[PDB]
């Protein structure tokens, strides 16, 4: 009933290590197929790239 996407903010400034670690965390925190999903397809693509 609720799915997530990625927020883009030009004012945000962060270490790239945060994004690379979130890449690992997202695969262990979310479900993306089978019977239901918590993510959009673009969000899964971004997590895969991370």
């Amino acid at each position: 009933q609720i799915i997530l996407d990625l927020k883009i903010d030009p004012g945000e400034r962060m270490d790239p290590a945060v994004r690379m670690v979130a890449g690992v965390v997202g695969h262990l925190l979310f479900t993306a197929g089978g019977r239901f999903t918590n993510l959009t397809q673009n969000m899964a693509r971004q997590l895969d790239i991370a």
Binding site: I8, D9, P10, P16, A17, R19
Partner: protein
């Protein structure tokens, strides 16, 4: 001499004979939005440093 028909004397029963064009109108409960500027919304990813 111009072949176009600019002024023509017509009867009152002939007035509504110019209705021969197909027009498409969108419903008022919908919305029309121009998203051309959305193609430049992005953020650059910085490389890890030292």
């Amino acid at each position: 001499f111009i072949n176009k028909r600019i002024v023509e004397r017509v009867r009152v029963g002939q007035i509504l004979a110019v209705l021969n064009r197909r027009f498409v109108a969108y419903k008022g409960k919908m919305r029309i939005m121009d998203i051309t500027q959305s193609l430049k919304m992005g953020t650059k990813l910085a490389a890890p440093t030292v």
